[PDB]
Design a protein around this ligand. Sequence first.
Ligand code: FES
Ligand SMILES: [K+]
Ligand SMILES: [K+]
Ligand SMILES: [K+]
Ligand SMILES: [K+]
Ligand SMILES: [Mg+2]
Ligand SMILES: [Mg+2]
Ligand SMILES: [Mg+2]
Ligand SMILES: [Mg+2]
Ligand SMILES: [Mg+2]
Ligand SMILES: [Mg+2]
Ligand SMILES: [Mg+2]
Ligand SMILES: [Mg+2]
Ligand SMILES: [Mg+2]
Ligand SMILES: [Mg+2]
Ligand SMILES: [Mg+2]
Ligand SMILES: [Mg+2]
Ligand SMILES: [Mg+2]
Lengths: 110, 295, 168, 86
Amino acid sequence: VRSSVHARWIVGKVIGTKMQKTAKVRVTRLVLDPYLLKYFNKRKTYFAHDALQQCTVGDIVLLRALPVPRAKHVKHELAEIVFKVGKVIDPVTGKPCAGTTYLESPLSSE
Amino acid sequence: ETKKPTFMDEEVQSILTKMTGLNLQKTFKPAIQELKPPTYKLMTQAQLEEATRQAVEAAKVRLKMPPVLEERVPINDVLAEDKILEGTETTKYVFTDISYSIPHRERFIVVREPSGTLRKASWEERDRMIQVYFPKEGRKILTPIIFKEENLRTMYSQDRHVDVLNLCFAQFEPDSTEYIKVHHKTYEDIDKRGKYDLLRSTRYFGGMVWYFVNNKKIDGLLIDQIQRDLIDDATNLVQLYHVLHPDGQSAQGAKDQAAEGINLIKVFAKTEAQKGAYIELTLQTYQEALSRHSA
Amino acid sequence: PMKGRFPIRRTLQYLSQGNVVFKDSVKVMTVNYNTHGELGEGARKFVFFNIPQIQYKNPWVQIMMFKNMTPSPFLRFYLDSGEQVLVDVETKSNKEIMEHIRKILGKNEETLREEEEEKKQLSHPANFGPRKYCLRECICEVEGQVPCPSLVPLPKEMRGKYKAALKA
Amino acid sequence: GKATDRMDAFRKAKNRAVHHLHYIERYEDHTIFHDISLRFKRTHIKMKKQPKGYGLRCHRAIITICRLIGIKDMYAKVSGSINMLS
RNA sequence: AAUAGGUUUGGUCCUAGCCUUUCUAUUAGCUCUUAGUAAGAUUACACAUGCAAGCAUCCCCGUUCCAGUGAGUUCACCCUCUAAAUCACCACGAUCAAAAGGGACAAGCAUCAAGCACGCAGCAAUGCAGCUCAAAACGCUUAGCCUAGCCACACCCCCACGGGAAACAGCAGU
Ligand code: FES
Ligand SMILES: [K+]
Ligand SMILES: [K+]
Ligand SMILES: [K+]
Ligand SMILES: [K+]
Ligand SMILES: [Mg+2]
Ligand SMILES: [Mg+2]
Ligand SMILES: [Mg+2]
Ligand SMILES: [Mg+2]
Ligand SMILES: [Mg+2]
Ligand SMILES: [Mg+2]
Ligand SMILES: [Mg+2]
Ligand SMILES: [Mg+2]
Ligand SMILES: [Mg+2]
Ligand SMILES: [Mg+2]
Ligand SMILES: [Mg+2]
Ligand SMILES: [Mg+2]
Ligand SMILES: [Mg+2]
């Protein structure tokens, strides 16, 4: 369970798939502006190992830290594709959706 | 068999709580201190009655009576007598265990004397050492001069008995000899000058009554309660007296006569009261005014 | 005046009024909400008013927001074990959402009281040092002890200038 | 007050002022009832209700006027154009 | 910038800069009685002289500390892992804390806008062509820092086999 990687679980958006078995993921965190006391998104890039090359640019993925980095910049592995780009499944109902509209009604399977 | 009640018994605390009274204007008197601009709320009659109810609850906490403890026994315990150290030091060492999570009455504080004796610190050294390393707000390492007899009479002349007791509570432990001596001198000045109203709606009224009842000197307080139409408190005072002096002339008289209410004050006034005549007169006057109101 | 609507949100007093302190398991909190629809109003007010308070009390928890990705709003928490907690928030007010996640993933008042007490052990009253760390810098500040020579000159007998002079 | 001579301007202003008196409500006859923040033209004045003993911590002219009204405790901050008449 | 004040005009209002009043530090002028306490080269320029590391039945241990300086400057903080060291020797440990790995971490200039190999996969062979960057990369300049203290340096060549050369940025002193 121990790891030398600082970020153990992070969610991000895939922004690149040009590296073999590696997805480039933009992770955003909220950071407090000390003067304005307003939160602004601060984005950081993480390389994630994607053995099956199943990540598509734009999908939301969950990354898990590796025990030790496998490369200079690869410290995480693809743990789960949360929201496949253009193929989102509503977690609350389990039905496919296109934006704020259902593609299959939850009433179909009762 | 039959134990006499303690100060913290629920029956005694209930009696003394009512005799004390709760006055929100006195209990929450404006304090002379650094001020901030006040805040304001718009409240309905119900929201106001709730806010006043919460104030009464906060007042019953502020009026919580301190426990009445007996004087602590001097500490005279020698841990070791290393005579080889005799004459090697001119000044004694006081060692205080400052481990944070220890009750102050469980902290070992020991003194190595120039004779070589390792002894436990005295009660006075203990309270002084606890203040050095665990300073409590309102307490001084050196005893303030306000507690000298000449300076207490100054405070009594100004009717500042409650300040005397607040200062004594902050400076001395409840079982200290200085804590008890000051309280007793304060209670006696109240009895001599009939200043029992100075302590009503304070946490110090019960301790004052406890002192009078145990010392069989309730005649002054009983008169003050009648002159103020507090017969319920005056009757409870006579009942508390009987509870703590069961084998007494007044307690038997009440049993033989099955006295209740105002009758208890008459039984007490004749048998045990020293100012029995002044009570009957003061009580007679009260019954008259009560009849005038009835008619 | 302070810019924007509800400038109270940009005050330290407001941000410190959050009551949700997540358990150490919580690593990521994703918020999926919809910009329009009467049934997603509580989630919008939750994002508007309370997400800043949650982040303030949980600076190391990643909070990411997603707009109009699904038909209904929901919160999802990712825990260190790998477990995921899905919280449906459609039809719920922002105050109910805050109370829900506090119950299932927030530290209770007892656990927080304990932590505050352990912090007090770090500042021992008996320790002497700079004001930044201790109440008193030197024992000379304690009444009854020999005061500092900068305020009360020491007797000639307790000073080395005259001890050597007599001895020499 | 306006005049060629200074003593005549003093007479006109002070005698006219008594015909244009305002009544100012005071909380407990020592402070204002609530914080007052207003702009008059380009002069901003922010006033804060204060407890007894705070004194008049205000622009010197506001201090002078407050003594005439009878306000004893108030904080005021003047921002923008600092014009005596405004 | 504050409770503010002075100053643009023939005059008014507005905007605006400048300055005044407050509190410290250094230096200069003039002046100065005592006591206690704190603090105390401008200069990483060159240094006369003296001293600053010994201990101990020989082995070793120590002189790697303390003391100094502020030249350089995101090696200081957190996590992971794990040496040396302390707990007499072992503690499958505790404390302490390197190296390595992950994260975080100054100011000014965008008239420094591109950097120029800065990536990934594979046991390897080798293959793919990526990686950083206007959310400020790369670059230049300034500066010891976040002060129970910490970092860096220790005549210079970042280092110190070697070379230049012969070293007080230890105390006192010139
Ligand atoms: S600071 Fe305590 S002796 Fe000076
Ligand atoms: K100006
Ligand atoms: K000088
Ligand atoms: K430096
Ligand atoms: K160097
Ligand atoms: Mg002009
Ligand atoms: Mg002109
Ligand atoms: Mg001078
Ligand atoms: Mg050093
Ligand atoms: Mg310099
Ligand atoms: Mg080891
Ligand atoms: Mg290291
Ligand atoms: Mg590192
Ligand atoms: Mg140019
Ligand atoms: Mg420099
Ligand atoms: Mg040199
Ligand atoms: Mg060197
Ligand atoms: Mg020197």
